[PDB]
Amino acid sequence: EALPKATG
Amino acid sequence: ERLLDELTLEGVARYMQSERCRRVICLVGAGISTSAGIPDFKYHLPYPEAIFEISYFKKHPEPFFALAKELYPGQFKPTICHYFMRLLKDKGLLLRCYTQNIDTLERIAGLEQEDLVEAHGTFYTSHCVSASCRHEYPLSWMKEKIFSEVTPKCEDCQSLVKPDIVFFGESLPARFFSCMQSDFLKVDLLLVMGTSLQVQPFASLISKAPLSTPRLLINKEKAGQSGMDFDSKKAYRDVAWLGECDQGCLALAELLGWKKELEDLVRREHASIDAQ
Ligand SMILES: *CCn1cc(CCCCCCCCCCCC)nn1
Ligand SMILES: [Zn+2]
């Protein structure tokens, strides 16, 4: 669905 | 197959002077810009992390821009570490610099676009949040709106204008995943500087390298351990130098024989920045 996202 | 003789900074230097060390990848974080004035990490934030989350920002952008006006540095001077990476570029050793930072200090230090993976974007350009408009605005327009304390709005949509930073909850640029697929099959050395490897998917980058590839951490604290193996009996390739990044890069440059080069580079480039 989307590219990997910025996560803490 | 341990390519390092000793698990020390000097061992990393000796390995870098050998013919096996041709392609070096740098993974850098906020720690390499703290000595430049860039900081590391009322409005009723539901949680303090929402200041950098895209959903909250789209709902309530005022806290972020207030913080931006508060923490906007008066000057942008790259540090000794940035110029160490610049020396790596000038000597044909730098395959890529993956940065978590948004201060563009790698560009100002002289790293070109092909050298860089700005994994979390940049503050330099900004865009309208409407995907059917995407009107682009420069850092001058953004800085004027930030210091006049007027929320940036698009001249075509009247929508919110956001700096091209990857907020928490946004996807990383496609260039990240394009470079990663090729860069880590060939990497001879990982230089991890100024990051505690706390933000994904950036941190996972340290596990993409081959198992024989040495990895040196220059950071105020050990990080990336399960994975980083510094202090076990099976340790064979991971070195940790704890302290300020500028000090670690000074020491590594001197051990490599580049002390005077790095000194001259820093002096001349800082003079050129103060001149303009
Ligand atoms: C998941 C992607 N991501 C982004 C970040 C960094 C979050 C902090 C952003 C700081 C903004 C500073 C505004 C002022 C800048 C002046 C040049 N981590 N992970
Ligand atoms: Zn627009």
Author numbering:
A (entry chain C): 396 to 403
B (entry chain A): 56 to 96, 109 to 293, 306 to 355
Paste lines from the article.
Sirtuins (SIRTs) are nicotinamide adenine dinucleotide (NAD+)‐dependent lysine deacylases linked to key physiological and disease processes. SIRTs catalyze lysine deacylation through a distinctive mechanism in which the amide oxygen of the acylated lysine transiently attacks the C1’ of the nicotinamide riboside residue from NAD+ (hereafter referred to as C1’ of NAD+ ribose), forming a covalent ADP‐ribosylated intermediate. Here, we report a new class of mechanism‐based 1,2,3‐triazole inhibitors that hijack SIRT catalysis by forming stalled triazolium– or triazole–ADP‐ribose (ADPR) adducts derived from the cofactor NAD+. These trapped adducts inhibit the enzyme without covalent protein modification, prompting us to term the compounds “Sirtuin Trapping Ligands” (SirTraps).
